[PDB]
Amino acid sequence: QHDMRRARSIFERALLVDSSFIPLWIRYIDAELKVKCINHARNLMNRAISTLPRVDKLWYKYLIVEESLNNVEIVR
Amino acid sequence: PLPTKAEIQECTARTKSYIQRLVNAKLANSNNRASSRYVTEANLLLNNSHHIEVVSKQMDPLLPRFVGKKARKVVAPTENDEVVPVLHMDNEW
Amino acid sequence: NELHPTLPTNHNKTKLLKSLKNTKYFQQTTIDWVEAGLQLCRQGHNMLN
Amino acid sequence: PPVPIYVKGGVWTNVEDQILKAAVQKYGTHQWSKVASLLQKKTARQSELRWNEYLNPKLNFTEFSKEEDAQLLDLARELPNQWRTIADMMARPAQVCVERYNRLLESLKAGDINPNAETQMARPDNGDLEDEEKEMLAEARARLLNTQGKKATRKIRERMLEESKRIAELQKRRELKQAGINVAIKKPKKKYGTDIDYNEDIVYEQAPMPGIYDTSTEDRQIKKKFEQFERKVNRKGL
Amino acid sequence: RGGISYDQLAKLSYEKTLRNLATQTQNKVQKDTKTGKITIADDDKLVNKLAVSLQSESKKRYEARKRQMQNAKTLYGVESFINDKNKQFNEKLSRESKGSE
């Protein structure tokens, strides 16, 4: 429906039920990125890797995103 | 260390006072007239300066008291910014 | 009745009419008994209706 | 209009064996009356006998080995004519055991009732079919089809009817729009006092708790895109 | 090789995407101390490429699953069933019982 604020609220309400669920985190990061909202996804990937630091896929997701934008200081 | 004999007393007194305030409010909101024999026993400044005197009113014993009171269904916004991390370690089934 | 005493409570004891009297809302008079009975019948009909 | 079959013990044909198999696959082993209702001219007990004696794939219909056959002579010697116990000792059906014992020790009229009909071989059928067997397979397919309750079937019907009702409700509005009178769409009514409409507000809106990075220009870009989409749906119509 | 963990499939997916990023490449920071916000100056291109990359990858995976659905819906050689969902349940039973014993 091209309404991004309701989709953000629904994803946040979806995380409040179950934060252990990784495909929800990955969809919400991708749903930020595909509409070209990179800073929202940076805040989101920060909150993801700081919530669940022992999960490998989240750090690697944030490393892919910072490589794809060519930000080598951030990847280091 | 074990906690010292003074902190046990300070904690016991402060929390006992709090539990007695809650119990007196719960027994004072009840419709039983018999509950108020089990309870165990203002000015505030509204601006820079105004000096008001907060008085209570004497209500009719027949009209309902707490006229705003009613049974409602409420959801609560669960709001935080404390992110807290989850600090873990690193065919048969 | 004599086997089981029920032993009244001698402290705080809020009574009804002695505390319904302290309000400004109740007032006091003397009337005939039969008038008070008829008024109670009118009031108790009106409440339940 | 069928005359009543009071005694239902017959000869098992091919049709009734196959309907019993495709009924046991769906209904399961322990409901027998619901299996035998599916195929007329047989009884719930005779369905149970036809399964446990003949149609069961766990049952052992082979030729007897030499150790098996000597075991049969010895067990028939030790236990005098207790054939269920013996057949339990051999993991074979008892009728096979009795007939093979007769074959060892050797070396029906018409108008009779055969008691052993459930343990005996089936009869293949004439080429076309009988009429009652056409009716039997028709009602058997009809009863093996359905997996719903009354409530769920009514839900299917109510969803289709509400769908067509909405279509008619939009049809009249489009006709009046062509006429030039714009009847707005009425909303459904609330069944209770705090029933929630979902276009008034984002109903339990959770804000995403901001971080260190800055999202002003991306907010403006989204707001531009959504406003332009709503205008395009207003003019052109999706 | 068997089942693979999540910490390993994560790395293999990361490395495949970087390999894709290298072949795709073949073909600052400002802290506002008033609020505390960080504005990173990213180019408009390489954001469009990231968005179109994610969109094209999701469409590719979607169409692959869509074609797998039809090719698994043609083959009736499993078992007898009565609807579209029983067929999937019976194929699940075949997949477990063939692998187990």
Side-chain angles (χ1 to χ4, degrees):
Chain A
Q1 306 299 317
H2 286 78
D3 197 351
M4 194 67 206
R5 179 179 172 182
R6 293 175 190 262
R8 286 165 175 168
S9 79
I10 289 163
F11 277 122
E12 288 287 323
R13 293 161 61 184
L15 284 175
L16 289 172
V17 179
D18 195 4
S19 295
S20 66
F21 191 60
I22 305 298
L24 180 58
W25 288 98
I26 304 301
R27 298 298 179 95
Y28 180 38
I29 296 164
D30 290 334
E32 297 298 331
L33 290 169
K34 294 179 184 179
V35 196
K36 299 184 289 181
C37 297
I38 179 59
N39 285 317
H40 289 276
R42 291 174 197 271
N43 291 319
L44 178 55
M45 288 181 283
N46 201 169
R47 192 257 295 266
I49 62 172
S50 61
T51 300
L52 297 168
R54 299 287 89 186
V55 180
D56 208 68
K57 173 66 187 171
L58 297 170
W59 292 96
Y60 278 126
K61 182 74 174 183
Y62 190 33
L63 293 166
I64 290 167
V65 174
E66 292 295 327
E67 279 291 323
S68 300
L69 302 166
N70 197 4
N71 296 321
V72 295
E73 295 174 352
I74 289 96
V75 180
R76 183 176 294 116
Chain B
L2 280 175
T4 60
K5 197 260 192 297
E7 288 174 348
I8 297 167
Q9 286 180 352
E10 190 269 333
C11 182
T12 299
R14 180 172 63 89
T15 311
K16 181 187 287 188
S17 174
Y18 182 65
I19 296 169
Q20 288 298 320
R21 289 179 66 191
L22 285 171
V23 169
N24 292 332
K26 184 67 191 298
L27 293 180
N29 290 327
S30 65
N31 286 314
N32 205 166
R33 286 185 285 114
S35 293
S36 65
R37 74 182 70 180
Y38 291 102
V39 302
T40 58
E41 291 182 356
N43 292 115
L44 45 89
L45 189 135
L46 253 278
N47 278 319
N48 298 110
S49 68
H50 263 284
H51 294 97
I52 70 171
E53 183 186 3
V54 173
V55 295
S56 295
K57 71 183 285 284
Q58 186 173 2
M59 297 188 73
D60 197 353
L62 270 62
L63 267 59
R65 191 183 63 184
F66 313 114
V67 75
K69 194 175 187 178
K70 194 182 265 79
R72 300 177 182 90
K73 283 183 182 176
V74 175
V75 288
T78 61
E79 54 184 0
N80 284 315
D81 54 352
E82 46 186 359
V83 80
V84 286
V86 184
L87 300 173
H88 288 170
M89 295 186 293
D90 198 1
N91 197 2
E92 199 275 334
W93 291 85
Chain C
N1 279 328
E2 291 294 326
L3 190 67
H4 300 290
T6 57
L7 196 64
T9 68
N10 51 14
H11 287 287
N12 290 113
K13 56 167 68 178
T14 65
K15 298 289 189 177
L16 186 72
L17 299 181
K18 189 183 257 77
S19 70
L20 269 294
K21 195 187 291 180
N22 292 122
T23 64
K24 74 180 184 182
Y25 296 106
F26 280 21
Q27 291 299 318
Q28 183 181 4
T29 182
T30 71
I31 55 176
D32 191 2
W33 188 82
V34 176
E35 180 176 358
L38 288 173
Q39 292 183 3
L40 185 63
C41 294
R42 298 183 69 183
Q43 290 167 353
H45 184 273
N46 202 353
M47 292 172 191
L48 293 181
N49 200 7
Chain D
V3 284
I5 307 165
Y6 295 113
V7 185
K8 292 184 183 70
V11 167
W12 280 94
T13 180
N14 193 9
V15 160
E16 290 177 352
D17 285 335
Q18 296 297 317
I19 296 170
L20 189 142
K21 287 177 75 172
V24 168
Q25 297 182 4
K26 173 174 174 69
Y27 286 119
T29 302
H30 289 281
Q31 306 180 2
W32 288 118
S33 60
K34 193 176 278 188
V35 167
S37 71
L38 191 59
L39 57 99
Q40 55 95 33
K41 290 189 285 187
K42 293 296 186 292
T43 320
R45 180 64 67 194
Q46 295 178 355
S47 294
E48 185 176 1
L49 268 306
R50 189 67 180 177
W51 182 259
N52 282 313
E53 293 292 324
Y54 182 68
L55 265 307
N56 194 4
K58 303 294 288 183
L59 291 174
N60 191 3
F61 290 97
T62 55
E63 295 293 326
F64 289 14
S65 297
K66 299 182 264 74
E67 293 85 1
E68 297 288 322
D69 216 4
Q71 184 180 1
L72 175 57
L73 278 176
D74 190 73
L75 282 177
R77 190 256 187 188
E78 312 312 330
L79 302 175
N81 65 46
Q82 307 169 13
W83 293 103
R84 295 286 184 178
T85 302
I86 288 171
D88 196 2
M89 289 306 300
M90 295 180 189
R92 294 185 183 270
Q95 194 60 251
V96 183
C97 174
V98 170
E99 289 179 354
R100 183 61 176 166
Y101 173 74
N102 285 320
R103 290 296 300 159
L104 288 177
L105 256 289
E106 180 65 30
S107 176
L108 285 173
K109 296 176 176 63
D112 292 335
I113 299 170
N114 193 0
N116 301 118
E118 294 89 7
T119 65
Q120 207 177 11
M121 192 177 177
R123 177 183 182 272
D125 287 327
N126 50 1
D128 300 334
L129 271 174
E130 195 181 358
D131 282 327
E132 290 86 3
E133 297 178 352
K134 300 287 282 185
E135 300 173 358
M136 179 186 285
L137 267 77
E139 74 182 6
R141 293 181 182 94
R143 198 184 299 173
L144 294 177
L145 191 274
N146 51 1
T147 60
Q148 294 301 326
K150 296 173 78 174
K151 303 285 281 298
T153 305
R154 185 180 295 117
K155 286 301 292 185
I156 288 172
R157 186 177 298 117
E158 288 177 357
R159 291 192 183 100
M160 297 187 74
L161 194 140
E162 181 66 30
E163 202 270 331
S164 67
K165 193 181 294 296
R166 290 186 295 112
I167 297 171
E169 187 177 2
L170 287 176
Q171 176 182 1
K172 289 185 282 185
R173 182 190 186 268
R174 290 177 181 174
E175 296 294 328
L176 284 174
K177 182 186 284 185
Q178 289 295 320
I181 294 96
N182 46 5
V183 173
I185 297 289
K186 66 179 292 297
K187 294 178 258 71
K189 62 177 288 187
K190 51 178 70 175
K191 301 180 179 69
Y192 51 101
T194 57
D195 199 354
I196 290 173
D197 192 3
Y198 289 101
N199 287 332
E200 297 294 332
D201 292 324
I202 308 169
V203 283
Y204 298 108
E205 182 184 3
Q206 194 65 249
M209 67 173 190
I212 51 174
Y213 301 105
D214 179 73
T215 58
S216 68
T217 177
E218 301 173 357
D219 193 2
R220 186 173 64 245
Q221 198 274 126
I222 281 178
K223 191 170 183 178
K224 188 77 180 297
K225 189 183 291 183
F226 171 72
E227 188 174 2
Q228 188 167 356
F229 171 73
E230 291 283 323
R231 290 173 190 265
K232 186 260 291 180
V233 174
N234 194 5
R235 270 75 173 269
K236 184 177 181 291
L238 190 137
Chain E
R1 56 98 182 265
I4 192 165
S5 63
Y6 273 146
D7 295 330
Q8 187 69 40
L9 192 277
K11 186 181 71 67
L12 296 177
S13 179
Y14 174 74
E15 288 178 351
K16 180 173 182 177
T17 53
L18 286 180
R19 186 168 63 238
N20 192 0
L21 190 274
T23 63
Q24 190 177 6
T25 313
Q26 185 68 38
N27 296 321
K28 290 187 287 184
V29 177
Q30 179 180 0
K31 297 183 182 182
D32 195 1
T33 59
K34 182 261 297 178
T35 52
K37 297 293 184 180
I38 287 172
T39 71
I40 298 173
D42 287 328
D43 196 359
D44 287 332
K45 294 186 287 186
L46 301 171
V47 176
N48 287 313
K49 283 173 64 176
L50 180 60
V52 170
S53 175
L54 291 168
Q55 289 175 356
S56 178
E57 185 177 4
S58 70
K59 288 176 70 174
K60 185 175 180 179
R61 296 176 184 175
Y62 187 83
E63 294 296 323
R65 180 75 181 98
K66 187 188 282 184
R67 295 183 294 115
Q68 187 182 2
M69 289 177 72
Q70 281 75 242
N71 291 326
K73 189 173 174 65
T74 59
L75 297 173
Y76 287 166
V78 47
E79 194 64 30
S80 298
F81 49 88
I82 56 169
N83 55 3
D84 189 66
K85 195 177 254 76
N86 193 3
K87 186 173 71 68
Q88 302 174 355
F89 181 74
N90 282 316
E91 288 177 352
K92 185 175 181 178
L93 263 71
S94 70
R95 289 198 306 271
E96 62 89 18
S97 180
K98 186 175 181 179
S100 63
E101 289 101 9

